[PDB]
Design a protein around this ligand. Structure first.
Ligand SMILES: [Zn+2]
Ligand SMILES: [Zn+2]
Ligand SMILES: [Zn+2]
Lengths: 98, 48, 49, 49, 49, 64, 44, 242
């Protein structure tokens, strides 16, 4: 999200360059039911309620570099030989050790 | 050299400025050492 | 071997429990006050992020 | 054992080969600096003093 | 043959292509000297400057 | 990244043989046959082309 | 004071005060242009 | 303070951290400069502010500005009676307006737990107490966010921005809120372009009642073509519109 608040896809290189966290917004469908002991029930559902952002492992199914051909990766300034499997957290490539 | 009465702290010494210096951070905002903050608390309660 | 997934799933439940605890606390204040609560405002997004 | 300069796990390198790019490498150091406006009194900016 | 004199070396030397690696450890990254440097104000003892 | 100009060991010119070497390989020459066709007799010079990796080709796949 | 956009590679003169951003691209990553000063390399 | 040179500008030296006479060489002060350190070589509101910012996915610099404004207004205490949440919402709105990506009061109310009335009251109170001012919002500030929330292409976004700017220049919407003008421009740009949007969706996105959209659209209705960009491609003619 830019300063003006305009959302835009975040490329992994931009996260690396601008020291961003490669995170995906997380939404959850929430159903709220209220009973006021008046033999009436009101059920209101808030579709896609923002609840946080999950850091995304690069070159995973939820990464923007998913299914992109090697030529496409080069267009994004990404090394095709790069295996992915890490996170960009404040621009730092973080690997989770088993 | 030592007396039992002297063990009781009737008068509290104040370390010199060399022992506890005035660190400078974020410009001219003098960052007082932890001792000064305790010394500031000591004097406040002592005056009260 | 706890890989990234299971390790992350370990964090999410702790962080999701805090999220659910937080909305419970936020809602309890408004319900006790007598006024309904806004769900969007009850959720603290910084907990998971 | 040419002249004793490779003893005890040392190596004698060809200077002419080094002159030709043998094992020549680049070293890149990246420095990051950010200007923060936190604090009304202090406002750091980028400019040559 | 000896480079300095051109005379054949009595022993025949094992010579051939081997894959060598240059390691990140350079001497320039390691050489460092201290001579009446910037001591600390509080401790009045040496520190990096 | 790019073919060295000189053989490291002897200083023989090697920088004008990578394109010819690739062309010879495309002509079904064996790697040894191509090197012999290019005048690389000393194994130090054959090492230069036999073990070269031309990364400059993939570096050009990134737009300036 | 020319800055090259990282997306479209547009050279645009940017003042110190005005915000850093591509004039037409809108991109927010800017690279300084190579110095006009001359630097000597010995081919060694 | 060279004893030989009274009032001499001693030169700081980083070799040992000492100040030397500018023209004597005499070292005044052994190692006093402290080279390493010198040369680089109230709660529950910041959390609430961060939650509000997260609900908008706005950047951290705006959050820091909002925190600074909150700390300031808590220092003056010219509005102590107001709720802390309302002060936080007002500070967030002020920061968003200041950084150049202004939001609408309805886009802060939808995030905060208070209504727009209190947000505006606290905004005015903070602007009065802090003795600061904010540049007036322009119709082009809400264009990018409104058209990004909608699935309109970039071409339609630029078309709407140009329509709104020309309309405000031509005084076709005198005294009307810039948000309504932006909504009308977005509506006409979407109807003329391939991707069409009804008044309802635009009202929800911009937080403007469809009646206000119609009122602001009828004023610029006869002047539709001259507001459009000269080089504008479309499938539904700009010459005919609802
Ligand atoms: Zn050779
Ligand atoms: Zn650009
Ligand atoms: Zn002097």
């Amino acid at each position: 999200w830019e300063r003006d608040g305009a959302p835009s896809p975040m490329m992994p290189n931009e996260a690396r360059l601008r020291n961003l966290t490669y995170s995906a917004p997380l939404y959850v469908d929430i159903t709220k039911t209220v009973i006021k002991e008046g033999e009436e029930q009101l059920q209101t559902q808030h579709q896609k309620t923002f609840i946080g952002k999950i850091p995304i492992m690069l070159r995973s199914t939820y990464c923007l570099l998913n299914g992109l051909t090697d030529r496409d990766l080069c267009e994004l300034n990404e090394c095709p030989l790069d295996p992915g499997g890490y996170f960009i957290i404040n621009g730092s490539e973080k690997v989770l050790i088993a | 050299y030592a007396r039992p009465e002297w063990m009781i702290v009737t008068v509290l010494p104040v370390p010199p400025l060399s022992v506890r210096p005035a660190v400078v951070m974020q410009g001219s905002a003098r960052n007082q050492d932890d001792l000064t903050h305790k010394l500031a608390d000591i004097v406040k309660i002592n005056n009260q | 071997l706890d890989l990234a997934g299971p390790l992350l799933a370990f964090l999410f439940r702790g962080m999701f429990k805090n999220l659910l605890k937080e909305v419970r606390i936020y809602a309890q204040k408004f319900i006790d006050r007598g006024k309904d609560f806004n769900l969007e405002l009850a959720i603290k997004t910084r907990i998971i992020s | 054992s040419y002249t004793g300069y490779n003893q005890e796990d040392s190596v004698i390198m060809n200077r002419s080969a080094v002159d030709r790019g043998f094992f020549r490498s680049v070293f890149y150091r990246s420095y990051k600096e950010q200007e923060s406006k936190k604090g009304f009194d202090q406002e750091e900016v980028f400019e040559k003093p | 043959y000896n480079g300095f004199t051109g005379r054949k070396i009595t022993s025949q030397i094992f010579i051939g292509p081997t894959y060598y690696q240059r390691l990140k450890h350079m001497v320039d990254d390691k050489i460092h000297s201290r001579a009446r440097g910037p001591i600390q104000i509080l401790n009045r003892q040496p520190m990096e400057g | 990244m790019i073919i060295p100009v000189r053989c490291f060991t002897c200083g023989k010119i090697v920088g004008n043989k990578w394109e010819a070497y690739l062309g010879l390989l495309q002509a079904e020459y064996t790697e040894g046959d191509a090197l012999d066709a290019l005048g690389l007799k000393r194994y130090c010079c054959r090492r230069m082309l036999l073990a070269h990796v031309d990364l400059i080709e993939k570096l050009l796949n990134y737009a300036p | 004071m020319i800055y090259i956009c990282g997306e479209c590679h547009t050279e645009n003169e940017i003042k110190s005060r005005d915000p850093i951003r591509c004039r037409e691209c809108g991109y927010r990553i800017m690279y300084k242009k190579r110095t006009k000063r001359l630097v000597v390399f010995d081919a060694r | 303070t060279c004893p030989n040179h009274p009032d001499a500008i001693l030169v700081e030296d980083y070799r040992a951290g000492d100040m030397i006479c500018p023209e004597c060489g005499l070292v005044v002060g052994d190692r006093v400069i402290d080279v390493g350190s010198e040369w680089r070589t109230m709660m529950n509101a910041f959390k609430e502010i961060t939650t509000m910012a997260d609900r908008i996915n706005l950047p951290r610099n705006i959050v820091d500005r909002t925190n600074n404004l909150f700390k300031q207004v808590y220092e003056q205490k010219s509005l102590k009676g107001r709720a802390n949440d309302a002060i936080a919402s007002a500070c967030l709105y002020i920061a968003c307006r200041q950084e150049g990506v202004p939001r609408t009061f309805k886009e802060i109310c939808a995030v905060s737990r208070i209504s727009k009335k209190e947000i505006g009251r606290c905004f005015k109170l903070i602007l009065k107490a802090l003795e600061t001012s904010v540049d007036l919002i322009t119709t082009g500030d809400f264009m990018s966010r409104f058209c990004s929330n909608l699935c309109l292409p970039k071409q339609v976004q630029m078309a709407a921005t140009h329509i709104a700017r020309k309309a405000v220049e031509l005084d076709l919407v005198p005294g009307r809120s810039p948000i309504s003008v932006a909504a009308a421009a977005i509506y006409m740009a979407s109807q003329a372009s391939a991707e069409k949007r009804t008044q309802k969706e635009i009202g929800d996105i911009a937080g403007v009642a469809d009646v206000t959209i119609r009122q602001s659209y009828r004023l610029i209705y006869p002047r539709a073509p001259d507001l459009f960009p000269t080089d504008f491609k479309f499938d539904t003619p700009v010459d005919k519109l609802p």
